[PDB]
Each structure stands twice: as structure tokens, then as C-alpha cells.
Design a protein around this ligand. Sequence first.
Ligand code: HEM
Ligand code: HEM
Lengths: 488, 488, 488, 488
Amino acid sequence: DVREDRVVTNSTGNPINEPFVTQRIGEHGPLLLQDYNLIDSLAHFNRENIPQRNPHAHGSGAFGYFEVTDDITDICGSAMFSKIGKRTKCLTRFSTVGGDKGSADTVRDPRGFATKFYTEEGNLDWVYNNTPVFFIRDPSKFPHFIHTQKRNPQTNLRDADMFWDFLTTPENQVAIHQVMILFSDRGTPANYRSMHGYSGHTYKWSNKNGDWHYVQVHIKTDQGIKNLTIEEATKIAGSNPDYCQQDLFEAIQNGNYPSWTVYIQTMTERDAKKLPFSVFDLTKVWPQGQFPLRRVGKIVLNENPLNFFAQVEQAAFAPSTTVPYQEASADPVLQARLFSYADAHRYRLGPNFHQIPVNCPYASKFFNPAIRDGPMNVNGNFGSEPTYLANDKSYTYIQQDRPIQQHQEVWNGPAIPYHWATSPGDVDFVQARNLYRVLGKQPGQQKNLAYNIGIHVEGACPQIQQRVYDMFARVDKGLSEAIKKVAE
Amino acid sequence: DVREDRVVTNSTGNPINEPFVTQRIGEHGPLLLQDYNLIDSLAHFNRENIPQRNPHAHGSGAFGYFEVTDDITDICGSAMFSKIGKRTKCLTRFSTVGGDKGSADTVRDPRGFATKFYTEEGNLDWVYNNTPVFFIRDPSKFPHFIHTQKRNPQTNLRDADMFWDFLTTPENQVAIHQVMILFSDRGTPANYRSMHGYSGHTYKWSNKNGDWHYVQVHIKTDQGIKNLTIEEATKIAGSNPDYCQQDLFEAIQNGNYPSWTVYIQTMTERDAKKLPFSVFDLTKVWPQGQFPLRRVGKIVLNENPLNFFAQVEQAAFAPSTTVPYQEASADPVLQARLFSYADAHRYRLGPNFHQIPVNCPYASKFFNPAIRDGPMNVNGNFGSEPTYLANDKSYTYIQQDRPIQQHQEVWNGPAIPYHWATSPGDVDFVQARNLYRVLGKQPGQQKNLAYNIGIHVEGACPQIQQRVYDMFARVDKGLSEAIKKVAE
Amino acid sequence: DVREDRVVTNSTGNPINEPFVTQRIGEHGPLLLQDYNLIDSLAHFNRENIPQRNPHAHGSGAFGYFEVTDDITDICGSAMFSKIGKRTKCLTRFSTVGGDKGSADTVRDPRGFATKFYTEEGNLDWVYNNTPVFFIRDPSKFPHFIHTQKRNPQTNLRDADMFWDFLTTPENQVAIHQVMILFSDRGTPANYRSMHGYSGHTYKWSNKNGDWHYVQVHIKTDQGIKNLTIEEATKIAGSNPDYCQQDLFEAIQNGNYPSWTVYIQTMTERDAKKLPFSVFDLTKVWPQGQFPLRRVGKIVLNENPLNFFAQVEQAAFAPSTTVPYQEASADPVLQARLFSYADAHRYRLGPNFHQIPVNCPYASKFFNPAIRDGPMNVNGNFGSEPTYLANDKSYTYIQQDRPIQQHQEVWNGPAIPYHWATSPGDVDFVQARNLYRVLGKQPGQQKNLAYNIGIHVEGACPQIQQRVYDMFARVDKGLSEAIKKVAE
Amino acid sequence: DVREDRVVTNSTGNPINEPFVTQRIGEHGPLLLQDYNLIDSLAHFNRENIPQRNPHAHGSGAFGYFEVTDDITDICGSAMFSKIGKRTKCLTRFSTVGGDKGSADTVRDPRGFATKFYTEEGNLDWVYNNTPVFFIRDPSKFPHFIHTQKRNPQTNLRDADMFWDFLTTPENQVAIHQVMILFSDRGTPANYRSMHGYSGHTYKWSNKNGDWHYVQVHIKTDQGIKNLTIEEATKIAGSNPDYCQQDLFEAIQNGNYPSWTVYIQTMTERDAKKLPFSVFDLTKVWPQGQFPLRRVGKIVLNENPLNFFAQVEQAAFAPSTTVPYQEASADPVLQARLFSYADAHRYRLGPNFHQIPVNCPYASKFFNPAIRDGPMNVNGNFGSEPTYLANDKSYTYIQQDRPIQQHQEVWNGPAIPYHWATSPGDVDFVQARNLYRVLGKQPGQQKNLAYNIGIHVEGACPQIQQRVYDMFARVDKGLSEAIKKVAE
Ligand code: HEM
Ligand code: HEM
């Protein structure tokens, strides 16, 4: 941190005797190469920026804690859940998805809700979105999808034809449950404090006996759901582009700390076999009548970052950062995510990104003899420790009899290249329709959904507009008509 | 380079069977590591972004040409000015300054106007802004200044206290001429087609006989100055963030090509001595009565880029990229800029950034036996050519009798650490005051200037607000009172 | 590519007046910042180096061709094997393993024999070594193993204790077959032209009718096996560190082109289950009596690189670079190599490494709408092509119903974490013992094996020396006694 | 810092329950994407290497201290020299020049002798060689010269034609004093403890009264000069490539700490005007009769690094890293070096290289409000500190009245493009010849000089060999005859 006497130095600690002097011949002659302090400052300035995240480039963050309020040790044996009242420090980063780093907060998008827990068994990242489902169930489709959400390669404008061309392509129409949620007013939250978080995917949690369950996590806001209409969202995007960032910072600064209650839905393997859809399908939700929400604990965000770049922009979240007893299911999208994020951190941040303080596991320090060297190895590189498992040294492997996934499903089959295209019939449209009816219970929302879709589809090509109307007619023909009226 | 048969392959040209298949055990088991096509696509997706420009992160581009319309061979011996009617291919990137890559087009900022001319004597970059002057005359002050134009290190919000604290600091108040232009409606142009371009700095151009002149360039728009008020600009920022990108793209696409007339002011070393201010000062403009504009040619932008990332985002512009007979003056800001841009390019784009097609000197091929190797050397690396000047090989050095700068000023003095702080008295406030006089001729512009400053200053804390009033009071006391009325 | 008028320019094509002039005040005053040509040259000089390969940092290369001399279309349906007499251009890079970039050629090590074939179905990389087997059959062991082959973390010296401590650790002693080949005089070849290349792993090749075979490839030298003794190799290591590079360059320059004959061993799925060891085990060779060598073609290297950095150092070889009908087996080491190489290339060379000319698939151009952007995208980035599969555009997917691996083995089981430690009994020592008997037919090679191990083991401390004697006594008690005699 | 319980974890602190297990279907089925611990280890392994130094890639290092033993406060006011007996911790890296990272210790080259001093006024780097002079006096000549010292661009072999073609080119022949030293037995030291260090360049040191002197520094070995013959050096280069690394490590390990006595030669500006050559010429030494060695203190190296990579390989040394009262002279080579090293560090190590522990100014902490962000900013990035000089915050600028270089020379002249080619006459050959006579005092050294040049020149082209003989005849015709006799 900052030296107490507050002496301004260059990079190598040499004192600067005047803040702005630059050497030249005389008072107004040519600048000299020997002014190394000028080059030191200008060259570090040129290197301030790292690549923005792809996607979720634009975001906000805050520190807090998770607290266990109820017993779930019969579902999960992770140390962070072992005792009621046990707190684990965390870091949450909220974000949008398609926009670049300087884009506005109040636009229509999913919001990310990524939390990092510093547990005794290492860091745990719950890399969640604010929606129960997502647009795809094929991992290979993700580069293609995010490209259509961003800017046209030539015009560099957000293109409504790309957007809707992808989503109305028959094999991609399984995105419809998610398109409904996006274009409802929940696609434009009032702020980060008044939205939910969801695992989306099914995960597998195990207790210490070896009993395991399929789980889905719900992080419900205690401040309550509050949204903006698209007209309010568009006005605020122009007057204050940093509206949600300002709201989170000011709420924590004023002591009005936001909290969320964490719940899980559990299901056994036998129950999963009896469902009309797959537990490995990201575009489906589990019925809360049959599978109710069991309470686990709370997330309170009570501390602002001191430095946004160092603590939030450099923060790295990955679903592969998991503790014992919490594992990923065979959901194809989650499976690919176990590779993608840590790979992105090695590019965006660097080979030794886990040594950056917010990414460092302080409650369970990194120690691995064979993970050494790399650029910007700053923690000492374990000194003279052998670079392999030397026989005259001692090493501890805890929980040796704990299973990773041996005790779970038995798989059978060849290596099949599979494209989980939109199924024949109505199975991938049922839940979008049930959601349309749930919006009928809330006044003004079915009308708003049609308006939100309509003013966006208006920009599209007439051939693509018709495919949008047909796709939505398969959900509800009344909804399809209402979209067309707004679009024309 | 799209192959005619349009066979979709992976990175190493191996054909893909089906666009979205990913390997797993059975149809719904875990994903397999042997699916190298999935990893190839996801890993390249993670590496799509390069760091944004610091500053001028957000921008638009277009190709076109320069045409000589008048003879100025008496002033400058560069090959691009030799014949009347001579055309040189160019690339122009327009941009804002403080905002990040995804920020809006219609915000208050200077606009960049950087053109790359592909001449027979290598490339030439006229890295200009849309304003006659700039905020600083000390190069060391630029990291500090851009930081106050961006976001607060903790809150990540754009902060009016930082902004006005830097500009009202006594030794930085020489920024006042530029603050005046910034907060006029010229600070929010209607589009890139209806704004000017200016050298800012004094350059030194010389003819083939060895005679030289201090030169300042003026790129005037043929569509005429058209501005927006701040209420209009703020509505469009939320409504269409890419308003000026859309405007430039559509204008060229419809055949309504934007053009600009290029003009220069010239001056002798003797005339520079009879001047009230220094020719090396960026915050000063040369009076057009004494030094009239002399026409040179035209810039017509008539071609959109095919790929924005490859051709506009990877474009690299530098003051140090200059042709024979065009050199930099001893302006300290320009002197440091001869270092900064190429240095920024090596980091942002890479050591061999000049091998990227838009940055390549196609009309004067790069050849240098000692500039070899480096990451991503893709043009052959001159094959087996000696890595030095081998005596059994031939090397041509053209224009050996042409002087660079030894035929110009003679300097005398020691190496002095100098800070060109705001002069005591009125010399650095005179031109801001006469700029206020010129705005009195245009109806409603002085009222708009005071409004634009007043609504911005309104967000600052009382102490800094008072310093802003005193600074503007020194230009005109009526202006200061008018800003204070809007801020209250 | 060199411009024929041979005018020396800087990076941006601007002509240099005099090769070595640098600007200063007067003739002997301080250097000026405005000399951008000096900084262009020095800054590019600073960026010449890329990270060396980890491992195989030190090596040599040459271009040539593969020619089909026999019909093996019943085994493999790849286009490169379709006609007898068909030629495919290739690039081979030979190398050592443990040593850094500046290390000597004639040291004891495996040699790499990596070939890239530019086929009509994309590039094919045969990333082979000069030994039939390898040290490990667990991919997780690879970081640990290369670490012990290199330098001690503190002393930075090659350490005989690390080396033998890893290899004599009980669960790693499956390395013994490879330790035997390494310490024979085959571990110090006379040159790259007089050594063999081997697949190591089993691969799965299939014909156009969907029939497949387990295959192992043998690339036999037509120049004949020639080796150095360790005393000769050590004397040449000091005398000429680049002995093998010089030999390959001069042999091709003098027209004495080296060639190798390619043979395959095939096996069906039924034959594999009758074997006393696993086809997925890298430390095992297939008996030639039961599985004879079948000839395929010839590799002839006949053209030297014009530029070593651009063509050999920037070359990228990966097992995952494979053409249709050639796939990897479930060998765990090969499975991890399917990820490792392409990942290393994205770091070492960069995101768009496949755009570097020698890595470019020229006979089957790279085209994929979703693999876009990234630093140093120099081939145009497909221009205005959509960044997804646009419905108003056309895309060809060839060999749509050709299987990748569905037509092969059916896997069954849970996700088991497995460590394939040295098996009980004699099974992992048998082939090491029969290799010792084969060296008994070639006079002097058994004494040399004992000597080569003895002088290396002598540098280890007595506890580790005893474990080495014990491990080799398990092969042959006579061998063990002879190693002990030389080491003491 | 290794965790006390020695629990092996992955990068994010999650405990590994078995060191080598990798997940697959069944016990011998294909590998799963799900095994993030395998990819964590393999991907970090792929990123262990950073680019080697260019030049001086191969080296060794150790920690120790500098102790003041004599008063020089009348010459230099730097705090590290202020009291007799004052110790300052240091780090020294010794190295060769042209060879790559794996190259041998006992080759013919200059040796580097770079020392970093952790003083109370920041770090100080004395980046010296083990020779009084160097090959060039023009900075632009440096990329060309190092290219000829390394490998041929095509053959990758060290080429005697490149080597001698550059040196015998008439305008480069000022290298002859250095070539004489290089090819004597001083060109192959017995070890790093048996050689001297020299500033090479003239520096300017000032006392607190403003009085200044031109200074040259001599770091004389207390162990005495001890050399190898080229036959001994070539034998050890094959037998033990890490001979000097082993020597330095074991000497410190066994308590036989190497020490050097530091001396300086001082000179006023008036004496500089009376000299027959320039104080700014690197190829000239100052006579010790007239300018005797004045004693300053001692450098003792008494501590080995714990980890070579983190402490020696990541160490960054730069002439621009200097404390108050020590400045560079207008020597054109030193002037360019003020840019080159810190620039190379930004590439090779990263933008925040100064945050790596060995480069950190621990006795005078880095604090600068405007040097922020950048990849791998691990020290907290000064938290919420303003990114500029905020007026409500406090900043200390010490030694405000201490001059940097104003008090020294007054320069006159235009910006001249100058190439300091070999001067006419004998002025650039005189000192090479008196060095030959000093070699005559030692028995066998003039025969060895002729032999060392002869066996190297032998490998060159006949017309280049003739030019070598003509250049050495200009020093001594008997020397030239002896070189010709060995080369044949
Ligand atoms: C196959 C599909 C997906 C892939 C390949 C993928 C990939 C990525 C990548 C590479 C990033 C940027 C990471 C970084 O640079 O630090 C990202 C961020 C993010 N993704 Fe995904 N993602 C996918 C699906 C999803 C889904 C379904 C969710 C929600 C359950 C999700 C939630 C997030 C969040 C919250 C972030 C931002 C984390 C932060 O604040 O830094 N992603 N994703
Ligand atoms: C000491 C002051 C200045 C410094 C150090 C400086 C530095 C920079 C840097 C490093 C960039 C980004 C370069 C890149 O990554 O390609 C930039 C961009 C730019 N600067 Fe400056 N600048 C300064 C003053 C100015 C002034 C006075 C002008 C106008 C005459 C100017 C006009 C521009 C423009 C137009 C761009 C955008 C170029 C593009 O479109 O890519 N700069 N500047």
C-alpha cells in the first residue's frame, strides 16, 4: 500500500523532485531521450488496459459474506455449510452480457451474478445469471450466439436481423423459454439489488456418506423484484450509463446492505428418470410444487471495493473453481464451461492470475510443487521446494476416500458427436407457454412483453419478422398477433 | 480470403462434418476431452479481444482518398503533394476520447480525426483532433489528465470533482481555451461528417530546396458545421449509442460521400519571433488575419470497411509515422507523442503490428535487414536476407542529401527539467476570451456554453465549484455568473 | 518478401537516409526523443524472442514431401493416401527434449520427429519421438517428469537426484522400458538423418466403409541407424553445439536428401483384447512376429528453410491437427496431448497462430464464420462474412455421414479418477528385459548400457543410487552389478 | 511460502485427494473434459517460460551487500555512500552475451556483471560488463552487431563470416580495442569470481554542493584474475555447460564468499577538454597514471537465490534505474540504453515487472498516483487513492532543489543526424596497440591472442579473412602474421 511519508517516486522507487518537469535543451528546445521518468509514466499509461471479458464485459462488484442459516449437511458435505451461523467471505460481480466495457447499465440483457467464496477447502465460484434458464443447450452454439448478440462484423452496429435469424433457426428455437424471460420486464432490472440469481444448470452435491442429489440453486432477493419499463431503461441509459453501479455503491456506502436468501431444489436419480424433460437441459426448470425450495443461507453484500480495476476488473470467476462435495452434472453447456473460464483467465489476466489478491484462496493456500514459474510469479514460486514429489519430502492429500463422481451415474455408449437440436413437438415450447400464463397473473406484463418484442423486431428484415411471428405463434397466437401490431 | 467452395473447417483446415456436434459418451453423457473442434472454437472465442485504445477507445472508420488541388511544392517537397490532381489512398478513424469501447457516440468530448495516407515514401499519419488546441502543453500531464476524464478508481463513476479539480489547479489553467471549445455545442457534433480537423501542433514542412516553414493544418468540412445541443445528445445516447457510426456507414453506402478541404497556415522562423506567444504551444492558435489559410487539397471518404475489427480496430496511427519533408516541431506534447503511439501499438496489437494489412505501407514496402523476428512474423521475415548490412549484398538509401532537421533551428542550453505551468498574467486567457467574443456573433451560443458548463459543474462539491467560477470569471465575469445560475 | 529496388525503410515504409545516423544536439550532445527510427529499431530488437517450447526447446527443421508407395486404402480413407505416387508437401522439425534453446545437439535424450503434412483435408501433424515407447502412461505425470529432466529449482543445475528419484518411485517404474532405450547408444544418435520415428501411441484409422484398426506407425531411416558413444557425444557438445543442425543443413544443401520409409502395424478390436497388455499403454510395443510391418510410403526431406525463426521456430505441431479417418485412441497420454499442444501454441505464438504461413493449411484453406478476430488477425478476418451461420448465406459441410468415433468402441462405466501405477508382477519389466537381450546380440551394447547409466548414476546420492540398482536388478541382476561397478 | 500442513491443492486452493488420478469412463476409457485439475496443471505447464533476455540470455546470480569503506561524499551525494560502514543489500546477475538460455558457461564472450542496490532513494542498477570498453559507439549499430554475434538467419549456425564482416567494415573498426580484449584469455574467465566489472561509460556523479565529475567505475576481484585457455573452455563446455553457475553456487554454499573492491576514476570538464579523445566514447579507457583509482567500498556476494526463476530469471536491470546524484553522460550508447532496458522489461516480464519481489524497491517504496492498473497489478494498485494529484490529498516531493543535469554542460547545435564512424588516423587504434604491448608483459598471452583469433577466423571466407589480417596489421604487423599462420 501507500507509503506513510507519501513521497512520489517513479516505478523503481527513485524520488521525483518536481511532479511535471520534463528535460529538454533550454526551456523550449527538443525533448531528451534521457528523461526516463517521462517514458516510465507514458509507457505504463500505454499498458493500463487488459482485454475486456467475452462476454459480460461491463459490470460492478462488491464484497460481503455468505452465512449458513439452515442445516443442509445431509445434502452437501462442503465445509462452508458444516455449521449453522458459519460465515464465509465472498466477492460478487454483477454484469450485463452483450455490451462492451463502456456500455450502459439499463439495457435489455441477462445480468450476471457471479460469487466467489473463500472457503477452508479453496475458492468456490457460483457463476450464475439472473434467469433460471439460458438460450442454448449445445456448447458449440455459444460463439455463434454471442456474436449475434454483439455487433455486425461490417457495420459495427447491433443488428436485429442477426439476433432474430439465430433464434428463429429451427434447431435453435429451444431458446424460446429464455427469449420470453429476456423480453419481459425482468430483462431490464431496476438495479442489481432487486433481481434474483439462479444456477441454471443442475449440479450434483454429495454428503459425507456418499449419498448425492441433483440440485438447482435459487438466490432470491430480499429487497424484492423491481423492474424498469423499456422506455425508462432507454432514458436512464442516456442520462446515467452507470446507474446500477451508482446504486450498488451508494446503497453499501449508506449502510443499506443488500441481501439475498439462498435456496436449493433437490432431486434424486430416480426422480430425474420420471421427469418429462432432462435434468441436463439448461432450457428447463423444475416444478416448485413437487420440488419445493429448501433454505440454506444468506448472502449480504456489505463492503465496497477500494479499487475497481484491481479487485473487480481483475476478478476471475469459473465454474471449475469448486470445493469438495460440489460437482458439475453432465449438462453439455456446464461441461464446456468447466474449460472455458479458466482458459479465458490465462489469456485476459495471465498464467499466474490466481496470485492476484482477489483470485487468491486465502483460507486454503495454493500449494502444488509442479505448478511453477510463468510470467509474473510474485508469491515466491515456493522457493527451493522440489518441482515434483520428492521422496525425502512430506505431502498431504486430504479426503483420500472421498469420491469425485465414481459413486454417481454409470455411463454407457460410444463417443457420439451430438447436436441437441430443438426436439419435435411441444416439449421445448411448453415451459415458455406456462411462463406466458404466469405473466397473465401480473397486470400489464403480457402487454409489455409484446411491446418489448415488437419494438425490437421492427428493425428486422420482413422475412425475419414473419419467422419471429410464427415462432411466437407456437407459444400463443394471441401473443404473436400483439407483437405484429406493435412492430407495424 | 473466403474459399470458393465454402467448406467450414477448424483452424488447421480440417473439415467439420456437422456445425454443432460435440462428443460425449452416449447421447447425454459427459463431454469428452478428445473433442478438439469444440476446444478450438471456445479457445479462439476467449481470445477475440485486444485491449482498447487508451484513450480514444470508441470510434468509427472509413477508407477514401486525398487529392491535391493546389500547388504547395514551394512549402513541402513530399511526394504526395508533387502534382495537382494526384491521389493518395487513405484510411480515417474518427473517435471520442474518454469513454470506453462500448460508450455512446453523442457525448461531450473532443473527437479524433486520424488519417493514414499510403504514400510512395511510406505511410503518413495525420493524428489530429476536431479542435484547434488541446488541454495541455506539458507531456507529463497527460496520464493525469486522461485519468480525470475517465472513472473514479473506487466508484468507477465519471466524477465531476476529478474533472474540474485538475482543470482549475493553477498551473493547469492553461487548459481554459480548450475547455471553452469543449463545452460549446462544437463539443457535441451532429456527426463526423459535419466537423473539422486540425493539426493542433505546429509542424515543420520543407521543400526540396531546403527552405522550411512552421505549418498548421486545417481540415474543413464541406458539409458544414452542424452541432447538437446537450439535451439532444443525451436523448440519442440512450436511444442509439452508435448514432454517428450508423450515420457515416449509411452516408457512404448511399453514395453521399463526405469530403473535407485541406488548408495550411505557414510561417517563417523570423515571424515566429514576432509572435506574442510560442509556436510550440498547443493551447494557442495562429490568427488568420496575419496568417491566412492556403488551400492544398481534398479528403473524400468513399468506402466503408469490410471488417471493423481487422481494418478499424487493428488500425494504428502515430505522429512518428511521417514522410520525407514533414517533421515535428519542438512542441513538448508532440515530442512525447513521437514516442507514445508506436509504443502503445507494440502492446495493444503486438511487435509486428505493421504487418497487419491496414498498417502495412503497401505503396512503399517495408524492408530493413535488422528489423527481424518477433511474435507473429507473417510476411516471410525477409527469408535468408542477412540480419545486418552484409558487404556482399546491395542496400539503397535514397535522398541522402535531404536534411531531417539539421537545416532548421539551432538550440542552446543545458538539459533543463521544465514545467511549462500557466503563465502569470493574461497571455494564456486572451484567446479563450476572444473565443467567447466569437460565440457572441452566433445567436444563443454563449447561453448554451454557460448552460453546458453549469449542468456539469452542478455535480461537483462546493469548493471545486467556486474555483470553476473564478476561473471562468477571469475570461468574462458575465459568463461566470451565468454558469453559477445554472449550477444552482 | 524483399522489394527489388532494395530501399531500406523503417517499419512504416519511410526511407532511411543513412543507415546509422542518430539525432543529437550538435555532433556529440545528448540523444533526442524525436529520433523515432532509433526507437523503432531498438524496440523491435527488444521483442524478437518468443517463449521457447516446453519441452523440445532446441531443434532443427526442413521441408520435403511424403509419397505414397503402396495401397493402404483398406486401412485408411484419408485423401493423402488415395493414390500411389501421390505427394504431399511436409515440414519436419527434429529436436531434443530437456535442454533449453541454446543447448547442444549431441546430448543424451529422446529426439522429436514432428512432421506436418499439408493435405487437401487440412493439415496433419505426426508428432512423434525417436523411441517406440515413452516414460509415462499417466498424463498428470508429465509436468513432474519434465521438471526432473531439466534444472533444480534453486541451483539451476541438472540434477541426478531428481532425475532418478522420479524414475525409481515405485508407481513410476513403468518408465523402465524407456529408461533402457534412453541409456543405450540410441539415446545419442549420430545425427537426425540416422534415427527412426515412432507413433508411440496407438491410433485409430478407418476406411471409407467404416471399418477401423488400431495402428502404430514406424518411420524407418533409409540412411541406417548410426549412433555416437557418450564420450564422442560429450566431446562434440563442446566442440560444435550445433552439430546435428549443421549436418541436416549441409546434407540437403549438397543434394544428399535424407529419406525414411513409413510402415504401419494394424490390429483389430478383437486382437486387442487377446493381448497380454493394453493397446492404450504407451510403455508397450507390439510384437512384429504377430503384427508385421506393412509399408505405406516415403518421407524425403529435400529443401532447407529460408528463415529459421519464421519457419521452424514459429512452426506449430499438435496431435489434434488430424485429417478425416485418422483419430486418436483412448491412450491417456495421447488424450491429454489432444489438448496440450494447441493450448501451448495459443500462448507461445498467439491466438491466430494458424495464420502464420508454415502453420497455414494452404491445400485446404481455413474458413469458419465463428472463428474470428483476436490479436494479429492478418488474413482479412473473412471480411464482412456473418459471424454465425446466416440463413441468407451458404455453408458446406462435407463428409456429413462419415463417423468420427461412434463406429468404434462402446465405453461403459462411471467417471473414475484413475492412476495407472506400475502393475503387480513382471508385466511392466518384461519388454525392458527382452530389450536387454536384443542388445546382447549387438556386441558391446550391454557394456555401454551399463557404462552410460553408471556415469550418470554416479552423480546421485547413495540412497537414490541403491534404488536405481534395485530397479535394474529387476530387469537383470548382471546389469545391476555392472552399473554399480561403473558408478563406484 | 509453503503452507505448513503441506496439503497439495490446485491453483484455486481446492485439495487434490490423489496426486495423479485423472478422470475417464471406466478404468481405461477416454478422458473427460470434466477433469479441471488435469487441465489446470497442463495449461500452467504450457505457460512456464517467458522470452529469454536479448542479449545476455544465459546467466547466474546471487545476493549480497555493498559496504562503504572510504569517503567519496565530495564526489557523490547519494545516500548509499553517506557513511563509512553503511551496507546496502544487492543482487548480482552474471552472464554471457550472444548465447541462448541453454548455452554453455565457458564460451568466449564478454561477461555481464549487473548489480541492483536496494537503497533508501530507490533501486540503483550498475549494468556493467567485465570489459573496460565495448564494440560500438553508435547506438543504432547495436541490433546489427548482436545479430552477427548470434546465429545465421537461415542455417541457425554461428557464422564467422557475419561476425568478422561486421567488425572489419571500415566505419565499425572502432570495435578493435574490444575485439583485442575479447580474443585474449580474459574472453574466457575461469569463473565469475575471477573477473572484473567496469562501467564502460562515463557517468556524471554530483555532490550535495552541485560540484560534479565525470566518473568511470572499476569493480576489481579480490580473488584475482584467473582465465582459461580456449581448449580448456571448449572441453568444459561439453563436459559441464553449467560450470560457472556451479562454481558460484558452491562457493557461497561452502562459505567462501566472493568479494570485489569498488574504485572510481574522476575527471572535471576542464580535464575532459584536454583529453586526446572523447569522454563520451565507449571504446576508450582513461589512463590510470593521470587519473588514478580512488577507493569506494566492497561488494560481497554471500547468499544464494532460493528459486532461480523467480529471483534471477525475473530480475530486471536498467541503466535508467538510478538514484539521485548519479546520472548518465552524453555517451550515445548509454543514452540509448536509458530507453532500451525498461522497454525490454515491459515486454519480457510485463507492464508491472517492478512489482516482482526482486525488482521491487523495498527500501524506498513505489508510490505514484498516476502509474496505475495494467495486467497483474498485485500490490493493491494503491486502493482508492486518486489517479492524479488531488488538491484535498497530500504529496511529498523531496530534494526539490537538487539539479538533475542543468548544472552540468551547456549544449549548442541543431538536431544533427550523426554517425560516429571510425575516425581517420590512428586515434581509434592507439589503445588497442598499447593493450597489445601490455599483453607482452605476460608470458604466452600474445601467442594465445593470435591463436584465439586464428582458430576463429579460419572458418571464414577468404576475402573476409584478408580484411581481418589488414585490420590487425594496423595494430601490429607481427600480430597479423601470427593470425594468418594459425588460420592456415
Ligand atoms: C457454453 C456456454 C458458455 C460459455 C462457453 C461461457 C463462457 C464465458 C466466458 C469465457 C466468460 C468470461 C470469463 C472471463 O473472461 O473471466 C463468461 C462470463 C460469464 N458467464 Fe458464461 N459462458 C457460457 C454460459 C453461461 C451460462 C449458462 C451462465 C449462467 C449459468 C453464464 C454466466 C456467466 C457469468 C455470470 C459471467 C461473468 C462472470 C464475471 O462477472 O466475471 N455463462 N462466460
Ligand atoms: C502528450 C499528449 C498525448 C499523448 C501521450 C497521447 C497518446 C495517445 C495514445 C497512446 C493513444 C492511443 C494510441 C493507440 O493505441 O493506437 C492516443 C490516441 C489518439 N490521440 Fe493522443 N496523445 C496525446 C495528445 C493528443 C493530441 C494533442 C491530439 C491531437 C492533435 C491527439 C489525438 C489523438 C487521436 C486522434 C487519437 C486516436 C487515434 C485512433 O483513432 O486510433 N492526442 N493518444
